[PDB]
Enzyme design. Structure first.
Site, PDB file in Angstrom:
ATOM      1  N   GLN A  98     -13.609 -13.082  24.252  1.00 31.80           N
ATOM      2  CA  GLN A  98     -13.512 -14.267  25.096  1.00 31.80           C
ATOM      3  C   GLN A  98     -12.811 -15.410  24.370  1.00 31.80           C
ATOM      4  O   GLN A  98     -13.091 -16.582  24.626  1.00 31.80           O
ATOM      5  CB  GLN A  98     -14.892 -14.707  25.580  1.00 31.80           C
ATOM      6  CG  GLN A  98     -15.559 -13.732  26.535  1.00 31.80           C
ATOM      7  CD  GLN A  98     -16.849 -14.279  27.113  1.00 31.80           C
ATOM      8  OE1 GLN A  98     -17.196 -15.440  26.897  1.00 31.80           O
ATOM      9  NE2 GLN A  98     -17.571 -13.441  27.848  1.00 31.80           N
ATOM     10  N   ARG A 140     -16.155 -14.379  35.805  1.00 31.45           N
ATOM     11  CA  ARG A 140     -16.825 -15.558  36.340  1.00 31.45           C
ATOM     12  C   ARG A 140     -17.476 -15.315  37.693  1.00 31.45           C
ATOM     13  O   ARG A 140     -18.268 -16.151  38.139  1.00 31.45           O
ATOM     14  CB  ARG A 140     -15.836 -16.717  36.454  1.00 31.45           C
ATOM     15  CG  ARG A 140     -15.581 -17.422  35.145  1.00 31.45           C
ATOM     16  CD  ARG A 140     -16.843 -18.103  34.664  1.00 31.45           C
ATOM     17  NE  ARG A 140     -16.757 -18.479  33.259  1.00 31.45           N
ATOM     18  CZ  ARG A 140     -17.042 -17.664  32.254  1.00 31.45           C
ATOM     19  NH1 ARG A 140     -17.419 -16.414  32.463  1.00 31.45           N
ATOM     20  NH2 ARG A 140     -16.946 -18.115  31.006  1.00 31.45           N
TER      21      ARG A 140
END
Lengths: 721, 721
Positions: free
Chosen positions: B261, B629
């Site tokens: 990430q 997300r």
């Protein structure tokens, strides 16, 4: 869950469990009101199962709201997405933005204005109508506008009261208020203060939005109810009124607070708000919190005794299950320097026990002007110090302006100092620096940037008649000050003040901040005189004309001030450091050992409070909230004589020393004539002090006069200057 | 004790309990790393009983540190006064200020410098040496200085690398770096970035201070280890190193994070920092968090498939025990407007089910320029929208400058617009450095708003020759531009951009912010061209106007822009408002239903990433963090054609579409040629579209040509402009 309940006294248990009808609770001195509030919130969530998007807990400061939400989450769980805990302004702006486009004439894209933008708008208003530099200062006008708005006074009805009072200033402020409001609405934005009043007005006038928001809300809480003025109280009452569904679902409004810790009346808070809470809501229930675990029994009893002397007050007796604790060791000093020496000595002695570091000791003073001497001794004994809610004594802006004026008075060669004080007092006619007037050095480095005489003669042709006349007056004042350099530097500072008009503006502004600035500057004058006297007696004796030209020239004085200013290398709270602050910012903190300075009448009870009963009671409550900051050790200090305006004033002990429980004699146990100090007596001449002995007014000082021998005298009856 | 354990999967249980030797843990996508971290900290305090004044937890953002401190306070108690949980910069500056008196040349009175003061100082430095208006922009120099400092490069040894590269720009930047650093140290201040390097250097050079601080610290915690560049990593390693007693007192390290990430490489973060963590700490243990509870299984599998193609990556397979969930809606549109229409239609359809409101839907785009059309449709269908991490499209400063240029070109007598654009597009030597020239002309003279033209001939004598030369060129070029109002709007805007030098200086800066601004300007050109087409030829010809135009001026464009500039009237997060943001600011948030726009190569894989493998892998990880997300619905949209820089470009589908396996994407759902739109073909002439049928590449458009009849054609093979 019962885990929330089986750890508390039954009083807060009953306060938590009780849910029918609106509730009121008196939060005692450090009785864990935040803990009781969050436990009650958790019990409400667990038992009554209130809607997460309907429960509203509101506060006034961000830190308290953050702590409350953190403790709620740690106690009941993370549901903050729909649960709301915010302050008055944040909640108000969020709710208004939710319906920001449903008001005609008010754009939903409105901005906010700081004090500078309001000043610009009001100066445009004045130049449209009158003059905002004589009797019409921008700060006074802004404060008056804010105070009048705080009571929900509409602009249309504001002009209806100007003829009622028959006062010219009232008519002027009403007219400027109306003009400011209408041209601010023409500016499609508002300030940081009128948002609450406008929200109240919109909710009152538009019925559909009021009904929608009443349906949108079911539970409303609040904290620190004392600071709530009339406007926010009206907002809360309208937002909790039970006329939507007639109370088929309960409307939970419970208010935590205590009328005896109300010190923020300078911002417009009303003590009547809580003392007449029962009158507004006849179906309420009240409960007291007489127990706390933060302080010892002696300090608690002292605070309870000192707060009980007010006339109109709800009865409340504090108690605790801890030990009696140490006594209250008061002290009497010869002057402010003696008091600072005593407090530094006591701090050092108490720190040398390995029980508590410097971070566990706090010192309080009534006003910033009583903060210089302490810092001096705290920079002399080497103990680090830090001040919260402000800056150092020499770091404040008013003393900065005065020392910059002195720096310019020293030599004409300075540029930054002269550029900073060109328009520090606006003065209207006399000096001006806006509209790019200050940048007028012809953008050419002809010699060094001063203009002045070049500016007065007309070197710069863009400068209009008003600005050139103002600069001519400025340079004439500078020349007069140059030619006045013949007396002691304290009188020099007084002459600077009377010539520049700083003192008159400071006295006529009539604001607590401006009054603090005036007192601070007068203390600076006293410090300058004290330095001059110390140099003249101990060091000069036969001053004549040394390398330093006169006795009190600005060279050595400015050198000392700068070198003290260039001493910020003292470590901060990373190591053991002591904390300094004023009383007004002491609310909400906790400290195990505390000292209080300036505990005599005239100073701690100000002249503004010696007459008005409201101010007297308010400052008594301030003394209460100052006292209750201790945990096991609280010390009180007073000075018999103190210097102000360059003169020694006599101030008796405060009326608060007798209000405290007398107990054993404790105030005389544990500018001035210290070792090496030279002073003057009108009948005996000059004298040098040899020995300092005794505690308090019992001290008798031995002074050697040189040719006239040694004499032992007192301090309050011998006219020593 | 056991309560913290009997609620978690055994992986995080073992991660919490394990305490011997330094520990490393891979935090999966939404695996609750913060909860596991705080539970481990609570277990450490309860079981191992670590000293509160010795345990250090660190973070990078204030919000995460505040949340962790909230969990600590609600879980273990309120000992936060002795344990520091803050960011790198705050903790570092506090540490260096605590010991700020033990360094020569550096004093604690130093004031931190923002970009403005550094810009002014480096501008003076460049004036001393070179010229900062050409090839030496202050922003580029500041960015280079910060990047070079971030790798622990001493200014003294910086002179040794200029001759190695044998590059004039490298020598210049090294010399200005050394000069700036020495002049800043002469200014007794530091910037917001060099504090870390200075702390590292002081801790390395002075052994006694390092020994004292090593004795002071015992535990160190870190979060989001990816953002840690080389400098802060070195600082942490030195602050946890066991060199105090040569390895006698061990250090405690537990590092959370995830190498997959890492998207903040634009600020200098290094992916090698975590992937080679084992090399610097051979005695560590690693553990993965392959389970998360936020997303559904389908989205999780899609993210796992897309992130797996990077060659250098630690193996990690995500899984969850929840249901499969819905499919993935992959839509293909005719153009950007078609895509915005589709996403608005889907948002409206999904909102009309009373399951989720507009606050549960989020839409992501790679760059700001890909939001304009979206906002338009979101202001057309009436659905409120808010933007996080920025402002509306018309509220950005660059488009503001260009529209102000247009407004001035319209009305020569405009004042505010002309005064804003004189120097904000920094020209200085180009246009002017200072701002107030009207005051030179007798404050305002006889209403001399356009004093610039009088100043070109040089009627004001107080201004220097360079300023008047610059102003003369500005007014002459503006006049020349005004004499070319016989072309299209888009060509006019492009001519403005090329004449004013905005484009070249924005391109040459070579930073993501300036690249975003350049793309924004090109999008504005595209919007201007589209409006010109809609107002001039398309839907604007026929018997009503024939060949003669309606005096088509830019006033229509200006009034349209002003009318649509009311996008700030939309309410904020207090209501049912949808959210818009860019991918880089999507880290750390969570949303139930997400849409992603611009999923084509050349746009989502940026032109700066088609060649450099590092940028390619970084943007792939960015796609991963964007995908993960979603919670239950994730929809992808792409456009076959789009207008950029005033021209229609052809972009294929991105390589990321085929990355996701072609069985979990519900492909399709139910330049552009919409109803009423007129377009032009070089062979068929003008045509007006009647019916829009199909979706994406399966869509065929019917156009009536008027006299030439109706023809049905395709979109990608018919040369329609």
């Amino acid at each position: 869950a019962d885990q929330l309940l089986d750890g508390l006294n039954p009083q807060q248990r009953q306060a938590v469990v009780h849910e029918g009808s609106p509730l009121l609770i008196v939060a005692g001195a450090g009785s864990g009101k935040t803990a009781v509030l969050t436990r009650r919130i958790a019990y409400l969530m667990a038992a009554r199962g209130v809607g997460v998007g309907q429960i509203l807990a509101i506060t006034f400061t961000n830190k308290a709201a953050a702590e409350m939400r953190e403790r709620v989450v740690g106690l009941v769980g993370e549901k903050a997405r729909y649960m709301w805990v915010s302050t008055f302004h944040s909640t108000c702006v969020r709710i208004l933005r939710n319906q920001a486009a449903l008001i005609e004439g008010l754009n939903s894209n409105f901005s906010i204005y700081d004090a500078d933008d309001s000043r610009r708008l009001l100066q445009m208003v004045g130049r449209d109508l009158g003059l905002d530099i004589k009797r019409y200062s921008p700060r006074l006008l802004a404060n008056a506008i804010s105070n009048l708005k705080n009571e929900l006074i509409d602009p249309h009805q504001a002009l209806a009261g100007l003829t009622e009072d028959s006062d010219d200033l009232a008519r002027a402020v009403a007219s400027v208020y109306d003009e400011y409001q209408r041209r601010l609405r023409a500016a499609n934005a508002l300030d940081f203060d009128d948002l609450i009043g406008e929200t109240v007005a919109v909710l009152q006038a538009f019925p559909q939005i009021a009904q929608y928001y009443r349906r949108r809300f079911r539970h409303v809480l609040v904290d620190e109810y004392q600071d709530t003025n009339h406007a926010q109280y009206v907002l809360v009452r309208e937002l909790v009124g039970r006329d939507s569904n007639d109370g088929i679902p309960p409307g939970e409004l419970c208010v935590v607070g205590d009328a005896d810790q109300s010190i923020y009346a300078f911002r417009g808070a009303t003590i009547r708000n809580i003392e007449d809470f029962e009158r507004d809501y006849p179906d309420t229930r009240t409960i007291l919190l007489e127990q706390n675990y933060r302080s010892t029994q002696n300090i608690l009893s002292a605070a309870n005794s000192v707060i009980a002397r007010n006339a109109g007050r709800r009865e409340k007796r504090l108690w605790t299950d801890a030990g009696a604790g140490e006594l209250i060791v008061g002290y009497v000093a010869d002057n402010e320097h003696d008091e600072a020496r005593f407090v530094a000595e006591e701090i050092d002695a108490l720190a040398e026990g390995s029980e508590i570091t410097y971070n566990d000791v706090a010192v309080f003073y009534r006003t910033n002007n009583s903060s210089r001497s302490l810092e001096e001794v705290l920079i002399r004994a080497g103990i680090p110090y830090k001040v919260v809610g402000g800056v150092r004594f020499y770091e404040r802006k008013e003393i900065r302006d005065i020392v910059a004026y002195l720096r310019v008075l020293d030599n004409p060669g300075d540029a930054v100092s002269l550029r900073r004080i060109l328009n520090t007092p606006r003065r209207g006619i006399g000096d001006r620096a806006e509209a790019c007037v200050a940048v007028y050095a012809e953008n050419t480095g002809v010699g060094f940037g001063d203009a002045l005489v070049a500016a007065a003669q007309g070197k710069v042709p863009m400068l209009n008649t008003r600005a050139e006349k103002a600069i001519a007056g400025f340079v004439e004042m500078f020349d007069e000050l140059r030619g006045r350099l013949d007396d002691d530097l304290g009188e020099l500072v007084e002459a600077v003040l009377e010539r520049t008009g700083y003192r008159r503006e400071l006295e006529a502004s009539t604001d607590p901040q401006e009054l603090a600035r005036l007192d601070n500057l007068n203390e600076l004058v006293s410090v300058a005189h004290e330095f001059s006297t110390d140099r003249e007696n101990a060091a000069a004796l036969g001053p004549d004309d040394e390398d330093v030209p006169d006795t009190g020239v600005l060279a050595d004085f400015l050198e000392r001030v700068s070198l003290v200013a260039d001493a910020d290398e003292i470590p901060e709270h990373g190591a053991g450091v002591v904390t300094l602050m004023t009383l007004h910012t002491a609310k909400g903190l906790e400290f195990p050992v505390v000292f209080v300075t300036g505990w005599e009448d005239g100073m701690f009870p100000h002249m503004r409070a010696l007459d008005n009963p409201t101010e007297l009671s308010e400052e008594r409550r301030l003394a209460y909230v100052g006292i209750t900051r201790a945990r096991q050790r609280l010390y009180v200090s007073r000075a018999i004589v103190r210097s102000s305006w360059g003169q020694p004033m006599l101030n008796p002990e405060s009326r608060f020393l007798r209000e405290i429980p007398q107990e054993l004699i404790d105030w005389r146990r544990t500018l001035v004539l210290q070792v090496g100090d030279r002073v003057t007596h009108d009948k005996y001449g000059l004298g040098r002090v040899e020995e300092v002995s005794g505690v308090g007014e019992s001290a008798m000082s031995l002074i050697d006069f040189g040719s006239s021998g040694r004499v032992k005298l007192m301090h309050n009856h011998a006219p020593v200057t």
